[PDB]
């Protein structure tokens, strides 16, 4: 029985990056070369170990994290980067050895007049830790004045809408992203290549 990669890669809608989804894959056969060749991807960068060689290992669990960011932000989805997306939305560890896959989704996630349903976190007191996920919605205090939960001067709502439009330049268009991470425990290793 084949691993259910399709319900992640071919999902009708994706999550806002601040509210990124994780899918656990287990108990199945996974062809990472035939997934390389599922379709045409704009980015498919595997850190550490090749895909053809991934087909010869086994793991306890593989995790598929997915979300939407701007094309120019995909370079932040890599170990050791910074910027608003790595700092406040989705963070990979320096020692990451999984894969990052991305493709242009202008046709699906942009709307005339702006798709305002995809958001990112713009303000945060501190940086995320690797694989942290912060769906908090508390008003951010930019100054000395307390905020008490009301927006105003120096008191900002922390999430910002991308407003994806079909006519944005390519660097600004929506990109769907999938991050593969590979977990091996002291337990049976049940996801393997054929």
């Amino acid at each position: 029985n084949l691993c259910p990669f399709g319900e992640v890669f071919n999902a009708t809608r994706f999550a806002s990056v601040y509210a990124w989804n994780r899918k656990r894959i287990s108990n199945c056969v996974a062809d990472y070369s035939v997934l390389y060749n599922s379709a045409s991807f704009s980015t498919f960068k595997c850190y550490g170990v090749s895909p053809t060689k991934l087909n010869d290992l086994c793991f306890t669990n593989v995790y598929a994290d997915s979300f939407v960011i701007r094309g120019d932000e995909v370079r932040q989805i890599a170990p050791g980067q910074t910027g608003k997306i790595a700092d406040y939305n989705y963070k990979l560890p320096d020692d990451f050895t999984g894969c990052v896959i991305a493709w242009n989704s202008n046709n699906l996630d942009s709307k005339v007049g702006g798709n305002y349903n995809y958001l990112y976190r713009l303000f945060r007191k501190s940086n995320l830790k690797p694989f942290e996920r912060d769906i908090s919605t508390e008003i951010y205090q930019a100054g000395s004045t307390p905020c008490n939960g009301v927006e105003g001067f120096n008191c900002y709502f922390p999430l910002q809408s991308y407003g994806f439009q079909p006519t944005n330049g390519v660097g600004y268009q929506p990109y769907r992203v999938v991050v593969l991470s590979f977990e091996l425990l002291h337990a049976p290793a049940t996801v393997c290549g054929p």
Epitope: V74, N107, V112, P166, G169
Partner: antibody, heavy 124, light 109 residues
Amino acid sequence: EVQLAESGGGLVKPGGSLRLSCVASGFTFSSNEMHWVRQAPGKGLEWVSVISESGFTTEYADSVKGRFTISRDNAKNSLFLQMNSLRAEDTAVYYCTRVSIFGQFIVATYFDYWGQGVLVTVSS
Amino acid sequence: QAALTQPRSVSGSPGQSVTISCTGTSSDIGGYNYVSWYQQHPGTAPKLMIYAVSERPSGVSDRFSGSKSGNTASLTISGLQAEDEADYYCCSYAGTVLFGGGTRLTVLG
């Protein structure tokens, strides 16, 4: 006046490599998305590749994906196209052309200026 | 086959009018105004003649005009002159570059 000055064409055997370059003058290069478009003899314009202003986003036609790499050097006002594993059917004139990006939007006057075009011939 | 469909050949006598059509879909020509037209003489780069469906750059003859209806754009050239003989390409770049296949315009002699 806006100018795009191309160089680097020529004759190469199938399997070989070439690097095309396009040097921009007369406009703020880092505010422009840049594209390569090619035209095989007697045929239409075929879009090939795009790079965003920052250089962080690149896309390719299926016909060249995996073999061509677009890149830019904003501090040198330069756009490049690295062409590897060339095949007969890549024989064409290659043009660079700009798309100004204003307020994150494509301007209505996209491809308003083009390079002069360089011939790439893949033959043995 | 090109993404946008144009006729291969159009022609008219000197002084007359001619129109070149460009058919796409509701998600390019039908849905957006990023419709441009390019002129190409043998041996030279494309030159922008019409943009935003109907607007012309300074220096382009006002004998060139553009319009659209439904999913079809039209380039019209009135008062034909010998120097108009050329290939013409329509394009739509509403987020994805879509070129027409090109029309050869002949000015009949």
